[PDB]
Design a protein around this motif. Structure first.
Motif, PDB file in Angstrom:
ATOM      1  N   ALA A  40     -48.912 -80.376  31.587  1.00 54.89           N
ATOM      2  CA  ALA A  40     -47.765 -80.050  32.479  1.00 54.89           C
ATOM      3  C   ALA A  40     -46.681 -81.116  32.393  1.00 54.89           C
ATOM      4  O   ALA A  40     -45.516 -80.756  32.272  1.00 54.89           O
ATOM      5  N   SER A  41     -47.055 -82.424  32.408  1.00 55.13           N
ATOM      6  CA  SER A  41     -46.070 -83.512  32.321  1.00 55.13           C
ATOM      7  C   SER A  41     -45.251 -83.439  31.016  1.00 55.13           C
ATOM      8  O   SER A  41     -44.028 -83.574  31.075  1.00 55.13           O
ATOM      9  N   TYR A  42     -45.906 -83.160  29.874  1.00 54.49           N
ATOM     10  CA  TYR A  42     -45.256 -83.038  28.563  1.00 54.49           C
ATOM     11  C   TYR A  42     -44.259 -81.895  28.510  1.00 54.49           C
ATOM     12  O   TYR A  42     -43.208 -82.031  27.880  1.00 54.49           O
ATOM     13  N   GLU A  43     -44.602 -80.779  29.171  1.00 58.71           N
ATOM     14  CA  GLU A  43     -43.794 -79.584  29.306  1.00 58.71           C
ATOM     15  C   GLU A  43     -42.608 -79.843  30.221  1.00 58.71           C
ATOM     16  O   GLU A  43     -41.557 -79.245  30.008  1.00 58.71           O
ATOM     17  N   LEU A  44     -42.752 -80.723  31.229  1.00 64.19           N
ATOM     18  CA  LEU A  44     -41.638 -81.054  32.118  1.00 64.19           C
ATOM     19  C   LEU A  44     -40.602 -81.858  31.376  1.00 64.19           C
ATOM     20  O   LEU A  44     -39.408 -81.585  31.520  1.00 64.19           O
ATOM     21  N   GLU A  45     -41.071 -82.798  30.529  1.00 67.36           N
ATOM     22  CA  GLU A  45     -40.255 -83.636  29.655  1.00 67.36           C
ATOM     23  C   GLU A  45     -39.507 -82.740  28.660  1.00 67.36           C
ATOM     24  O   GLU A  45     -38.301 -82.920  28.461  1.00 67.36           O
ATOM     25  N   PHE A  46     -40.219 -81.756  28.082  1.00 67.99           N
ATOM     26  CA  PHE A  46     -39.672 -80.792  27.139  1.00 67.99           C
ATOM     27  C   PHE A  46     -38.565 -79.965  27.805  1.00 67.99           C
ATOM     28  O   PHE A  46     -37.455 -79.872  27.250  1.00 67.99           O
ATOM     29  N   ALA A  47     -38.845 -79.406  29.011  1.00 66.57           N
ATOM     30  CA  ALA A  47     -37.840 -78.627  29.754  1.00 66.57           C
ATOM     31  C   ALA A  47     -36.604 -79.482  30.058  1.00 66.57           C
ATOM     32  O   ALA A  47     -35.496 -79.090  29.709  1.00 66.57           O
ATOM     33  N   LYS A  48     -36.817 -80.674  30.618  1.00 60.32           N
ATOM     34  CA  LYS A  48     -35.778 -81.623  30.997  1.00 60.32           C
ATOM     35  C   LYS A  48     -34.894 -81.989  29.816  1.00 60.32           C
ATOM     36  O   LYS A  48     -33.672 -81.873  29.922  1.00 60.32           O
ATOM     37  N   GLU A  78     -27.959 -70.350  26.779  1.00 64.05           N
ATOM     38  CA  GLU A  78     -28.301 -69.946  28.150  1.00 64.05           C
ATOM     39  C   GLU A  78     -29.795 -69.547  28.276  1.00 64.05           C
ATOM     40  O   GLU A  78     -30.433 -69.819  29.299  1.00 64.05           O
ATOM     41  N   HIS A  79     -30.327 -68.892  27.240  1.00 65.25           N
ATOM     42  CA  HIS A  79     -31.724 -68.469  27.165  1.00 65.25           C
ATOM     43  C   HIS A  79     -32.636 -69.699  27.236  1.00 65.25           C
ATOM     44  O   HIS A  79     -33.610 -69.711  27.994  1.00 65.25           O
ATOM     45  N   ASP A  80     -32.259 -70.754  26.496  1.00 63.52           N
ATOM     46  CA  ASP A  80     -32.943 -72.036  26.467  1.00 63.52           C
ATOM     47  C   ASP A  80     -32.937 -72.640  27.854  1.00 63.52           C
ATOM     48  O   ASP A  80     -33.969 -73.149  28.281  1.00 63.52           O
ATOM     49  N   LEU A  81     -31.803 -72.525  28.596  1.00 67.81           N
ATOM     50  CA  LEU A  81     -31.746 -73.043  29.969  1.00 67.81           C
ATOM     51  C   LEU A  81     -32.669 -72.266  30.924  1.00 67.81           C
ATOM     52  O   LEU A  81     -33.325 -72.885  31.767  1.00 67.81           O
ATOM     53  N   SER A  82     -32.762 -70.924  30.742  1.00 69.88           N
ATOM     54  CA  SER A  82     -33.619 -70.037  31.531  1.00 69.88           C
ATOM     55  C   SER A  82     -35.053 -70.361  31.290  1.00 69.88           C
ATOM     56  O   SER A  82     -35.815 -70.376  32.259  1.00 69.88           O
ATOM     57  N   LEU A  83     -35.441 -70.617  30.013  1.00 65.99           N
ATOM     58  CA  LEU A  83     -36.819 -70.988  29.671  1.00 65.99           C
ATOM     59  C   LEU A  83     -37.154 -72.286  30.344  1.00 65.99           C
ATOM     60  O   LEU A  83     -38.199 -72.357  30.981  1.00 65.99           O
ATOM     61  N   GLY A  84     -36.253 -73.280  30.259  1.00 65.71           N
ATOM     62  CA  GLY A  84     -36.440 -74.554  30.948  1.00 65.71           C
ATOM     63  C   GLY A  84     -36.758 -74.369  32.432  1.00 65.71           C
ATOM     64  O   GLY A  84     -37.769 -74.883  32.912  1.00 65.71           O
ATOM     65  N   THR A  85     -35.928 -73.563  33.150  1.00 62.73           N
ATOM     66  CA  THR A  85     -36.078 -73.239  34.575  1.00 62.73           C
ATOM     67  C   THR A  85     -37.407 -72.553  34.846  1.00 62.73           C
ATOM     68  O   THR A  85     -38.052 -72.885  35.845  1.00 62.73           O
ATOM     69  N   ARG A 226     -49.455 -68.198  32.728  1.00 64.29           N
ATOM     70  CA  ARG A 226     -49.007 -68.587  31.385  1.00 64.29           C
ATOM     71  C   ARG A 226     -48.723 -67.347  30.497  1.00 64.29           C
ATOM     72  O   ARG A 226     -47.850 -67.404  29.613  1.00 64.29           O
ATOM     73  N   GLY A 227     -49.462 -66.256  30.765  1.00 63.74           N
ATOM     74  CA  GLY A 227     -49.296 -64.952  30.134  1.00 63.74           C
ATOM     75  C   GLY A 227     -47.925 -64.402  30.478  1.00 63.74           C
ATOM     76  O   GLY A 227     -47.178 -64.008  29.583  1.00 63.74           O
ATOM     77  N   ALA A 228     -47.557 -64.468  31.776  1.00 61.93           N
ATOM     78  CA  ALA A 228     -46.254 -64.050  32.318  1.00 61.93           C
ATOM     79  C   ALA A 228     -45.094 -64.861  31.707  1.00 61.93           C
ATOM     80  O   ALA A 228     -44.032 -64.305  31.427  1.00 61.93           O
ATOM     81  N   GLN A 229     -45.321 -66.157  31.473  1.00 63.55           N
ATOM     82  CA  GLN A 229     -44.362 -67.081  30.880  1.00 63.55           C
ATOM     83  C   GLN A 229     -44.119 -66.765  29.399  1.00 63.55           C
ATOM     84  O   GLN A 229     -42.975 -66.819  28.945  1.00 63.55           O
ATOM     85  N   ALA A 230     -45.192 -66.432  28.659  1.00 63.68           N
ATOM     86  CA  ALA A 230     -45.165 -66.115  27.234  1.00 63.68           C
ATOM     87  C   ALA A 230     -44.446 -64.793  26.908  1.00 63.68           C
ATOM     88  O   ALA A 230     -43.983 -64.631  25.774  1.00 63.68           O
TER      89      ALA A 230
END
Lengths: 260, 260
Positions: A40-48, A78-85, A226-230
């Motif tokens: 989760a921490s690595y993914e937060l860094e990735f989103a940020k 914008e899609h990249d920003l939505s994925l981040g969110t 995670r299924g919903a996210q994918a």
């Protein structure tokens, strides 16, 4: 159920085995909790990080005129920003739906495991105390028996001999009654270790059942999450690819010239 | 096509406008190239970091016995490693199918833009030189005309006056012929700026068309690539969720007891 506890209570060291299973289970939940939290921490860094550049890319592109695929790239950024969110929200929900109920059940199992271990040490200490008291009471009776014998080898002197024999006999009888009461007390502590044996293993089996109930539940919710996210990914890129079809090279330069 | 170049060649500063469009286009491709490359780097860090913990999680879990959902979590950790491997391959293919052809077309457009700008400065410098030569030749003729007039106010002295008038008249005629040839040379350089005008704008329009051709192509391949990557996610989690259905709490502890 009650049959499993018996299979284990028959085994010398079944309590220890059950308590060791509970230790192993907790370390396993601990490792699973630590991996998800680190991930989760690595993914937060990735989103940020990806959201910083995507925003900077947006600010930049929106100041441009007559650039080819300008709208496609605005959508793509914008899609990249939505994925981040979506990623940040998914992490927050995972900490809530997975980490907290699993962590809470684990610490509960560890508090009960630590209690049962102390209880098990206590009941065994009581047994060793009863055996040690019995060995002393046995040696005491040997001494009183030796004493009585010494006053039993064979009229002022006769009455005295009879008195000393009668007193040594009273002390030999009281030390006999004591060592026999020590046998009974050690037998009592032995039956007590068997009450503790069943009590500890049945509770450890019920706690493991509960832990497994929370683990399946939170894992199933994690996968659904995670299924919903994918799901958000494929439709987005196929749509972006579809947007490329009505674009004609040089059309934007031609619009630029006509605007000038 | 040829009509667009004319609309722009009619505009005073059409060459500059076209050359400015090419500068803007290159900066735009530069920014798009920098964002994808920065994004790819963040994703490499993400793959690298998540693959470290997933591998450590694998080494750990495979040393455990009778742990609940042990196989599910082995698959889950392995899935994370597969995504990592897919991510690294996707980045490598993006650097190859997107970055390299777009970067190559951009630097080509920048080498041609820089050339055309120098050519445009050169042709304008030649025109200013022709105008400046014409202004000198005009002022020279004024002087020779003034000279002739001074020898035209009104027999040894008569023959001399006639000689000085005839010589000043020859010099006035030669300076006339020179200033007139300078008008023609300036007219020639003016027609030359119009040849350069059409040549530069037509080539800039053909280069922009080409750039747009590469940009659409590599964007479409990028979307198809990232689309393919996004597909691997949903089926994986729905399968992992399906694996949870035949798991029964306490079954593993029961296997553990029977193995002991």
């Amino acid at each position: 159920g009650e049959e499993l506890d018996l299979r284990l209570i028959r085994t010398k060291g079944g309590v220890d085995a059950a308590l060791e299973y509970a230790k192993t289970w907790s370390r396993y939940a601990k490792e699973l909790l630590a991996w998800t939290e680190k991930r989760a921490s690595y993914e937060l860094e990735f989103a940020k990080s990806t959201m910083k550049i995507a925003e900077a890319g947006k600010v930049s592109i929106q100041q441009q005129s007559h650039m080819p695929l300008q709208y496609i790239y605005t959508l793509f950024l914008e899609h990249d920003l939505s994925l981040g969110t979506l990623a940040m929200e998914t992490v927050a929900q995972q900490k809530r739906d997975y980490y907290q109920p699993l962590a809470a059940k684990r610490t509960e199992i560890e508090k009960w495991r630590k209690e049962f271990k102390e209880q098990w040490m206590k009941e065994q200490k009581r047994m060793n105390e009863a055996v040690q008291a019995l060995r002393r009471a046995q040696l005491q009776y040997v001494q009183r028996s030796e004493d009585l014998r010494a006053r039993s080898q064979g009229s002022k002197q006769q009455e005295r001999r009879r008195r000393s024999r009668e007193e040594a006999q009273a002390k030999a009888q009281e030390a006999e009654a004591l060592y026999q009461a020590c046998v009974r007390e050690a037998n009592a502590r032995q039956q007590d270790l068997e009450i503790a044996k069943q009590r500890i293993v049945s509770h450890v089996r019920k706690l493991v059942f509960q832990g497994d109930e929370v683990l399946r539940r939170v894992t199933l919710s994690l996968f659904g999450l995670r299924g919903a996210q994918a799901e958000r990914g494929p439709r987005a890129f196929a749509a972006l690819a579809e947007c490329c079809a009505p674009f004609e090279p040089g059309q934007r330069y031609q619009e630029f010239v006509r605007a000038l």
